[PDB]
């Protein structure tokens, strides 16, 4: 199964007022997720993006969080994680979500979906989501899967106008209070390869993508930071904003 990094979710309260410092990453207004009462703004990088997410209809999201789908859904994590701002999850791209569902189901991993999804464009974009429902404990919310209705790469020719090619996502850093468990689960669910193992962290990689996934020991369990290679940077820097860390590195 060919998996690639699709997007990272950052929960930001009062997202309509929000912009990145010095407009380092340009943003484009997204749409509204009718099922959940959430809306987004998108930071297109290169064949992947940053999804900034907020809640417009709180009563709808709270209702939805109490359902079975709500126990796993990306939007309802806002409620379940007590409205704490920051990176919520990562989403992995597939061209065959049914093959992913069958592969996980053949390993007895309880899945939710495929869930049909849509949002209107400012001029309709469709996709399906599939979630992992771990019966055991999760320190880290499991990454979820996406299959865009639009073909690959029919999506790359439509969004190339928005891609900011000076940037390239390199690494996603996850802090876990149970690294051993997080690694074991991610190797099982995502068919990842082991890159590095030491007393502090484990680096993982998808078989069909160049992004590193660093799971490091921490006093917290969370999606912590993203490392973005910046072609226009001469010196590294980090931006802490609304509970998330965006690290920028030259080359
Ligand atoms: Cl975990």
UniProtKB/TrEMBL annotation:
Q: Which InterPro entries match?
A: Glyas_Bleomycin-R_OHBP_Dase (IPR029068), Glyoxalase-like_dom (IPR025870)
User: Pfam families recorded for this chain?
Assistant: Glyoxalase_3
- Where the record annotates domain Glyoxalase-like, the positions are 5-190
Q: Which PANTHER family match?
A: BLL2707 PROTEIN (PTHR40265), GLYOXALASE-LIKE DOMAIN-CONTAINING PROTEIN (PTHR40265:SF1)
Q: What's this protein's name?
A: Glyoxalase-like domain protein
Q: State the organism of origin.
A: Staphylococcus aureus
């Amino acid at each position: 199964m060919i998996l690639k990094f699709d997007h990272i979710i950052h929960y930001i309260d009062q997202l309509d007022r929000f912009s990145f410092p010095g407009d380092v990453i340009k943003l484009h207004s997204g749409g509204y997720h009718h099922k959940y009462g959430t809306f987004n703004k998108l930071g297109y990088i290169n064949e992947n993006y940053i999804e900034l997410l907020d809640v417009e209809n709180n009563e709808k999201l709270k209702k939805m969080a109490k359902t079975i789908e709500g126990g796993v859904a990306f939007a309802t994590q806002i409620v379940q994680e007590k409205y704490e701002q920051g990176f919520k999850n990562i989403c992995l791209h597939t061209n065959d979500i049914e093959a992913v569902k069958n592969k996980l189901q053949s390993e007895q991993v309880e899945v939710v979906g495929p869930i049909q999804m849509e949002r209107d464009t400012h001029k309709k974009v469709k996709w399906q989501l599939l979630y992992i429902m771990n019966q055991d404990d999760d320190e880290i919310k499991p990454p979820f899967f996406i299959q865009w209705e639009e073909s690959d790469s029919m999506r790359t020719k439509k969004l190339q106008k928005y891609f900011q090619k000076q940037f390239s996502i390199e690494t996603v850093i996850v802090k876990s209070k149970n690294r051993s468990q997080t690694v074991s689960n991610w190797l099982k669910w995502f068919d990842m390869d082991i890159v590095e193992e030491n007393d502090h962290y484990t680096d993982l990689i998808l078989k069909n993508d160049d992004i590193y996934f660093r799971i490091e020991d921490g006093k917290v369990s969370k999606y912590h930071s993203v490392i973005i290679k910046d072609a226009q940077a001469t010196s590294p820097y980090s931006i802490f904003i609304r509970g998330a860390i965006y690290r920028f590195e030259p080359l």
